[model samples]
Target: EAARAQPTKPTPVKPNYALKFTLAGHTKAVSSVKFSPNGEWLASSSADKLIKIWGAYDGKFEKTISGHKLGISDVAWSSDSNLLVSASDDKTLKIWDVSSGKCLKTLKGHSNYVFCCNFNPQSNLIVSGSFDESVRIWDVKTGKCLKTLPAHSDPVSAVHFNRDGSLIVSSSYDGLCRIWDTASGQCLKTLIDDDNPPVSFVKFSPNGKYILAATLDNTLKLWDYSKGKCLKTYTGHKNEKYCIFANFSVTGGKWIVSGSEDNLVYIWNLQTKEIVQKLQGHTDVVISTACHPTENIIASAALENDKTIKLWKSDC
Candidate 1:
């Protein structure tokens, strides 16, 4: 499903071609999906509390890892591709050694449910957001909570590290996004959003100067990290935008892909602030999305209406 970059820049006009693929098998709503660093595998989490790994291109079944007693909200691949970490509403996070399909360790310090967890690009650490209104950093090898970040006043729905892993960014239902210094775990800036709905997800751009965030108000907003100001508002979706992620596609264009309650995935031109393409396939609310690390491919999971996942590609 590799896609080449289109020679011409993407325009606001929707493409005539429809990008589609069906990933069948889950019996409940698919909550999250992530791509391996090399784009070889796709991992998905579901309300069934099971995580399924699949071949990204062929959509062939690989393995299923199960044990969480409650619905799993997020899944992320380690930089090395040897491990997969999942956060669950069951109030726990499990680190799975992908090669062995065994739960290497369980992080259980959060008093309430874990909302999201992601491995830093460097691979030695993991960060998690929780309903306990806090974010925590953990040592990947020891499974020990190294730092407890308790600045958010509401449920922390997103947690991510900068490209250099020097800083951490988190968004919460409290309507704020905060940047934290990884060394001291000190809150750097509290980005208050008085006009936007609470932000549910946020991610640093690949270059580290900007951020893409999804709001419960049904829009995606881009921000300038240096000034801590909203740069652009992306209103391509009619439903609440729940998740967002960015990556350089095979054609070398920076793309921001988003999922919404509308059950569709929208691909945007990050630089131009326009919807380059609209991917329609999922039959239910699309809650989470991730781009392939080195390819023009993406995987998104439906939240509740459809218990399925979808893989998409562009015709470059």
Candidate 2:
């Protein structure tokens, strides 16, 4: 029984999720980052009025997309990774074809800043949250506003689709989270804590069974949205001033990841509600973070003070 007759390689560097790339180009704060669904490119939107595409693996710069008259606040990729939609302070949403780097449609309707947006799972629809206190759904092909529901009393900060794209959930500075039926635009539920702390970001879990929200209370919570109750509260990094966002780690749904005002990326173990690791590099508020769609890679970006996107990867 001598070590099971070794046949494979002896050893290799462990997966510490070390820093892999530091990409710089945007002249202002990078607000959003996502790995394309196809895992080929990483897309980032910035306050510089530009969006950049980078090779997801080697971190090579590829393209710069711009058109919004004002700074962009967020961006999302279609399910096929062939298209992109961005929300801007110009009070408009724009769709672009990734391959040609061309603007396809400019959807204008929101009365104020368009803060957050997401493409539906089927790629036919897009949802956006705005300072106008409305959540608008758009037909991706027509670039038409399909529905604009009065979503909040304050600015709507983040909006996202459920797993199958049948429902949309939005979080707002109004201190609430609302779930809506995508078809009829009916409010299915509202999630709020008794304290009524302002919420800045919210999204559904992959299984579409739970909700995770980032509250201005300096804590991130996992919610049993169906019951309108919170199940866990994670703390450590600061989040009292900004509208930060968090996500369930895509690899196994085992970790909750978010950028903090502390200038670090804090990842928490789902069950234990414990900090598993803190990624360090940035010197300013780390605002947005996105994990690779199907890999152990994560991308993070900071405010105008940093102006760089950092990529981290795990060998495991």
Candidate 3:
């Protein structure tokens, strides 16, 4: 009865920056979108086996690279901006020279589809998650498969490295998130059944103390890294949820912002487990979201029934 007695206060009107550009060119659902470290360029990958680089503020098409024999699953850019890495359903990871748009190297060894991949901050090393229930560490420059870490029993969904690149985190359909030492390829901790329904994404806090996992079960779980313990579970989706994407506030506070498929993005006060606001507008499911490295700006990708990629902005 206490939950129903409280007045439902109006959610604050968050001034949304308009959809500055509508990038229309992909025929299929766009899977991923990421902004470079400098926020000068945006890279997108779709199921069409091609990647498009776009001018961040101008909405101009920069370049398109194609070579993947199967659908491109994920894309990552090096910290220095000299190279682009892409993982494909064809079970290979390819590194490309960004300036010349030439294939620099191809990494092979994944026995099944490569679902996601990421690069360490200072090293030219790459980590890839595959459908064959494993993650592989690669020497990006030498094109060598460094080590294969067997952790997930199901398809590995997302792979991410901490800010300093000393640790790596991965989530899987097997309902677990695992942390590893990048240099030794050792599983340091395993966080299992985090109350996130078949997790889709897992990301480390920029400061590297906490990790966030988003699950299809309509909740987000936050975990403490040092002690390897579940800290909190955030719950608020009104309908079937697709993903939980979270990032810290610019001031490095304990607040986080997460987006869901229910056409709403939520801002949460981590210390209180309360939803502060819900930024809403999309008419369809929101698949991917990324926060700016230094700014309050968040870029999200939403797919309508018409098959278009809609970019949204929320400056907190």
| Of candidates 2 and 1, the better by lDDT | 2
Highest lDDT: give the candidate number. 2
What lDDT score is found at residue 183 in candidate 2? 97
Q: Where is model 1 more than 4 Å wrong at Cα?
A: 1-20, 241-252
**What are the candidates' C-alpha RMSDs?**
4.1, 3.5, 7.7
Candidate that beats the other on lDDT, 1 or 3, i.e. the better one? 1
- Model 1: per-residue Cα lDDT over 112-212, one tens digit each: 98988999889899999998999999999999999998868889989989988899999987888889998899988877777857878888877888877
Please give, for residues 58-172, the per-residue lDDT of candidate 2 as tens digits: 8899999989999999999999899999999999999999988899999989999999999999989999999999999999988889999998999998999998999999999
TM-scores of all predicted structures: 0.90, 0.95, 0.86
Q: Please give the TM-score that candidate 1 achieves against the real structure.
A: 0.90
Q: By TM-score, how accurate is candidate 2?
A: 0.95
lDDT of 3 by residue, 215-249 (tens): 77777778887887879878885324443345665
TM-score leaderboard ranking = 2, 1, 3
Runs with alpha carbons beyond 4 Å of true place in candidate 2: 1-15
